[PDB]
């Protein structure tokens, strides 16, 4: 799971890979986006949301 954080825009970063011999190739840094059940009130539908840990730290924190 790496798809863009639904409520921030934390997309993947793209770049290279500095090998020991410096033969760089393409790689990307995916954000730690986890699938959580999200509600809008005490006891809501608990739909679904792939969201980053920084939002688990502040924002849409339900469970």
């Amino acid at each position: 799971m790496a798809a863009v954080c639904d409520i921030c825009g934390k997309g993947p970063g793209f770049g290279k890979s500095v090998s020991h011999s410096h033969r760089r190739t393409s790689r990307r840094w995916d954000p730690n986006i986890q699938t959580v059940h999200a509600v809008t009130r005490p006891g809501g539908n608990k739909k679904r949301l792939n969201v980053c840990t920084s939002c688990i730290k502040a924002g849409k924190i339900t469970r």
Binding site: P42, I56, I61, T62, R63
Partner: protein, 47 residues
């Protein structure tokens, strides 16, 4: 994490005494169950 504890919990202690939540226990056990709230500005309400 500093949550205003509103229920007698063995882990944390007496209601309104203190709090040392390990950044997640309260997130998925106190805040969804209605046992504690976020100490945003309620510290004045508690004391």
């Amino acid at each position: 994490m500093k949550l205003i504890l509103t229920a007698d919990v063995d882990h944390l202690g007496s209601i309104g005494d203190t709090v040392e939540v390990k950044d997640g226990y309260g997130r998925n056990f106190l805040l969804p169950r209605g046992l504690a709230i976020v100490a945003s500005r309620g510290a004045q309400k508690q004391a």
